Paper text:
It catalyzes the oxidation of glucose 6-phosphate (G6P) originating from glycolysis to 6-phospho-D-glucono-1,5-lactone (6PL), whereby the cofactor NADP+ is reduced to NADPH. In the present study, we describe the crystal structures of Leishmania donovani G6PD (LdG6PD), both native and complexed with one or both substrates.
Crystals containing only NADP(H) diffracted to a resolution up to 1.7 Å, and crystals containing G6P or G6P and NADP(H) to 3.3 Å and 2.5 Å, respectively. Comparing the apo structure with the structures complexed with G6P, NADP(H) or both substrates reveals a rotation of the N-domain by about 45° upon ligand binding. Moreover, the LdG6PD wt structure, complexed with NADP(H), revealed a disulfide bond between C138 and C56; however, with minor conformational changes, an alternative disulfide bond between C138 and C61 or C56 and C97 is also possible. Without bound G6P, the H250 and K254 side chains face away from the binding pocket, making the usual interaction with G6P impossible. Interestingly, NADP(H) is always visible in both monomers of the dimer, while G6P is visible in monomer B only.
Author numbering:
A (entry chain B): 5 to 50, 55 to 551
B (entry chain A): 9 to 49, 56 to 475, 480 to 552
Write the structure that this text describes.
């Protein structure tokens, strides 16, 4: 009747206006009026319904609740809720999923917060704003304290009522808690969950996503792990690295272990050198003061590059189960001696030669005289049968010459019989600026003018090319999906974390003691010349 | 014009369909694109030869020039080299045969030019090329005729416009091997190169005997006249592209070098298939059989190059040394390791059966098909089955090497399978690996995999293999030619089996033309280490 049609009309109007507002607040048009008109007309011309529910029957047989602590904050609004929106649109959340933002910040108008704050960071609202309103019906806000027994009793009563209204076979409910909070709050809120908001005894798992930093050295990290272990075990904690995507991990694991050709050469008999590189053209972008207490090694090397190394270098796991892979990550990291300062070259970037990038020290939030490294190259030695003597080079840098993340394996040259008509084979696994995996090999030159000794180097693509170029879901979103699926492969385990800090902490101590000081390099160059000399001195050979 | 436009279109799309359906890429769209750009693809001759190739006179003497091979293949191959600028500009070509030719210019124009490839391009060059051709009517066994031939060659060598004296002489025996010893003795006594300078090389045609004893007698008959730097025993089918794929892809690369062994390889198959039968010419195939025709010679050379140890250098004779060394490790083939076939009429009668040929003796048991297992008993290959397969009148024209690597059962189990390396020569050149890869997308956990083909080279269905070998002889590169010692070892691998066959101990199983062959051959292959993909 009139009631149904008029609520539908206001709902459609509000849905359009919410998309317009979100496009205006993101695009920051100087002329709001002009912008709202072009957008409205383009939305008209664009039929958006795409949500094929693709979860397995395990996922939709029990209630699911996702609780985002710190929901008021920068990561929650800009990354976590939009990643949940993407999973929602990809059909990867249960149709009855309940999402609760939990934070201390008072919110007098929860719908406004959902439509004006959260929705602003939902990507691709031109073709998906239709789904945005549906998604937001799954989101509620609990204003509460992280350290209140009573608030967590009240939250539990809210969760239980939704769980008990579930229409599905099993009882209880699964609970995913996301700590979008400073680490200084983790121990208190984990205590609160454990006291007051664990899953109903009648059924359901609990998982807790822990955000970085996980300490800043062996002692501080172990203290945080020790603070959380009376509340959650290692099947429950998920220590997340946003940068480690499913695609690169599967390139590393499957291409080697599924195949005789690559399994057989993944060892010191065949490999001369391994480099893992994380390069950015951006600097610290006005947040230099926050970076100054972290440095490039804690920022991306002790965590992100070291996990890549463990997956690259691990022995064959007993099975493809996640904890069998994490077992081998731990085993291989224990074969690594702590990095010494003679095996490290540090840099600190100065203004780019064209003036477009100011120097690190020119940031007014950076303490005068700071020796914080924005660049590091270092050698790690893996002392076991498979890798003894193989240099493993980790390199990371801000404000260098290109944005680029890759693994580069150089194989030992076949000197005979081709001599100067061949060179080291290479295997490259790239994540940025785009995914690629390929080998560089020596092949014949076609045609009669080419005798046997005339060759060239070619790049053999190792990747499967599908019929259609299908959407790339980002690394972060695949990891939240992994946590929902109960797959801990790409998350750092408690023992794994401790071994990794013990590889890096002596070096970090020496840096903080002043024992090694960064070399200036202009923003936009490769970094210090001493770093490329170091790489050349540690087994790498130019093409 | 429009019905022809439609004709052109439909033709392009026919080729693309055949191309796409042979490669079967999952990315149909981009394969179609690049193969279309590829299909998009006269003129005077630029010389491509080295300065040393044109430093001396060159005479090419084709014995048996009256014959089927000479007119249909040898002279047209020389024509193709001439048009490609691979023959030195002043080359002289002399046909020598017993047949009286009262009128040489007409023999060249009505007989020889008929079989030249009329690529419409080359056509402008035929009368030019014919000016390089003369004819000597003589006996193969006459010393005096070869002295007379020598005087004619000298007159042509002395016309050379170049400082170097003398002349290089390439003699081509397009004759039955029963005449080879006669010709070689006559050259030795009558027409060796001038003493002031020049080499002599002699291309010898197959069959190189028919067993160890007869082959050794032929080699013994020729060795008083020419040594192994002068004799070129040619195999028309062994193209330079396949050989370079075999040698360079392995030995220049750590990745392939390290897995080219029994620790990593489960099975090796070398296969030569044709859809044609013996084509009414079965009478002279009948005393040869498929094993002598293409397996003891062509497939075994491929095998030697695949299986050899690393040569001391890439020099021709270091490679031939290693071909000899690995052939010496091969056990003589047993009758239990050989399945024979003989083709009957196709199911639709389109192809008549082998015995329906009137030139085939009734009740012939000649094999048109054989699959066999060879054992290479050395450190690199012990335990690795090497399967050779050749067949007439089977289901497709196809020539390839297929290497299957040992499966990695752990940890992927049923989500992986054997890797493969394929090196294909027919119907077109290709070289690719098959490995297990991840499947892109969030839908695919670690166990969701795909068997992915990775093309190193892939060409669609340019001097051919034969011309490239004639060029190799002119360049003095013996790599792809079977050496005297190599030849003897190859016959010793095959001769016990061939003798058993000639005494009836195994007999061919019939298979209809157009089928794969006898079902027992595929049973044998499956029983000897080969596994089906997917
Ligand atoms: N792009 C990013 O921002 C990245 C962040 N991380 C990590 O994710 C987590 C969240 O990061 P981010 O959102 O930027 O951090 P914020 O500084 O924005 O804190 C997030 C929320 O937590 C609450 N908060 C802040 N300080 C305290 C405190 N002492 N006690 C209790 N609550 C506090 C606040 O919510 P309220 O006051 O309403 O309770 C705040 O809005 C951090 O651990 C961060 O290191 C790592 C990956 C990327
Ligand atoms: N497509 C083909 O024909 C293939 C054949 N071969 C081999 O090439 C060589 C030539 O092949 P093909 O042309 O078919 O053979 P032919 O039997 O047709 O011999 C070619 C010429 O040699 C002469 N000839 C034949 N028999 C004798 C004989 N007893 N004594 C002296 N001369 C003889 C004849 O010329 P004349 O009487 O004028 O002296 C004949 O025209 C053979 O060794 C063959 O095995 C291998 C590759 C392919």
């Amino acid at each position: 009747q009139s009631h149904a049609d008029q609520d539908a009309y206001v709902a459609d109007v509000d849905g359009i206006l919410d998309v317009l507002r979100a496009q205006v607040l993101e695009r920051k048009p100087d002329d709001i009026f002009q912008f709202i008109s072009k957008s409205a007309l383009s939305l008209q011309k664009d039929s958006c319904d795409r949500i094929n529910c693709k979860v397995k029957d395990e996922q939709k047989s029990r209630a699911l609740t996702i609780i985002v602590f710190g929901a008021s904050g920068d990561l929650a609004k800009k990354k976590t809720f939009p990643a949940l929106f993407d999973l929602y649109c990809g059909g990867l959340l249960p149709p009855e999923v309940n999402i609760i933002g939990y934070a201390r910040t008072k919110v007098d108008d929860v719908e406004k917060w959902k439509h004006e704050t959260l929705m602003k960071y939902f990507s691709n609202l031109s073709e998906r704003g239709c789904h945005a309103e549906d998604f937001l019906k799954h989101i509620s806000y609990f204003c509460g304290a992280y350290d209140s027994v009573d608030d967590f009793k009240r939250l539990d009563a809210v969760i239980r009522e939704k769980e008990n209204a579930f229409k599905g076979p099993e009882k209880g409910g699964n609970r995913l808690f996301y700590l979008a909070l400073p680490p200084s709050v983790f121990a208190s809120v984990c205590e609160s969950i454990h006291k007051g908001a664990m899953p109903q005894e009648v059924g359901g798992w609990v998982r807790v996503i822990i955000e970085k930093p996980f300490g800043r050295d062996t002692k501080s990290s172990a203290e945080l792990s020790q603070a959380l272990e009376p509340f959650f075990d290692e099947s429950q904690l998920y220590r997340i690295d946003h940068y480690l995507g499913k695609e690169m991990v599967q390139n590393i694991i499957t291409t080697r272990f599924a195949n005789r050709i690559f399994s057989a050469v993944w060892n010191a008999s065949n490999i001369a050198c391994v480099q893992i590189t994380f390069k950015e053209t951006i600097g610290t972008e006005g947040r230099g003061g926050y970076f100054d207490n972290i440095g490039i090694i804690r920022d991306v090397m002790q965590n992100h590059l070291t996990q890549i190394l463990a997956l690259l270098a691990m022995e064959k796991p007993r099975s493809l189960d996640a904890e069998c892979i994490r077992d081998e990550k731990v085993s291989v990291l224990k074969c690594i001696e702590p990095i010494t300062k003679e095996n490290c070259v540090l840099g600190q970037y100065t203004a780019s030669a064209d003036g477009s990038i100011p120097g690190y020290l020119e940031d007014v939030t950076v303490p005068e005289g700071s020796t914080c490294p924005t660049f590091a190259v270092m050698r790690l030695n893996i002392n076991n049968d498979r890798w003894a003597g193989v240099p493993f080079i980790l390199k990371a840098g801000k404000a260098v010459e290109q944005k680029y993340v890759a693994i580069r394996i150089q194989f030992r040259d076949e000197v005979h019989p081709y001599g100067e008509a061949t060179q080291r084979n290479e295997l490259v696994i790239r994540a940025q600026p785009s995914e690629a995996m390929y080998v560089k090999i020596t092949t014949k030159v076609p045609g009669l003018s080419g005798d046997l000794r005339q060759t060239h180097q070619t790049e053999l693509d190792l990747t499967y090319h599908t019929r259609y170029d299908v959407r790339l879901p980002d690394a972060y979103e695949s990891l939240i999906n992994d946590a929902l699926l109960g797959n801990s492969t790409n998350f750092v385990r408690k023992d794994e974390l401790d071994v990794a800090w013990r590889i890096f902490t002596p070096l970090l101590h020496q840096i903080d003691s002043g024992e090694i000081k960064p070399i200036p390099y202009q923003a936009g160059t490769r970094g210090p010349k001493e770093a490329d000399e170091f790489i050349a001195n540690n087994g790498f050979k130019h093409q």
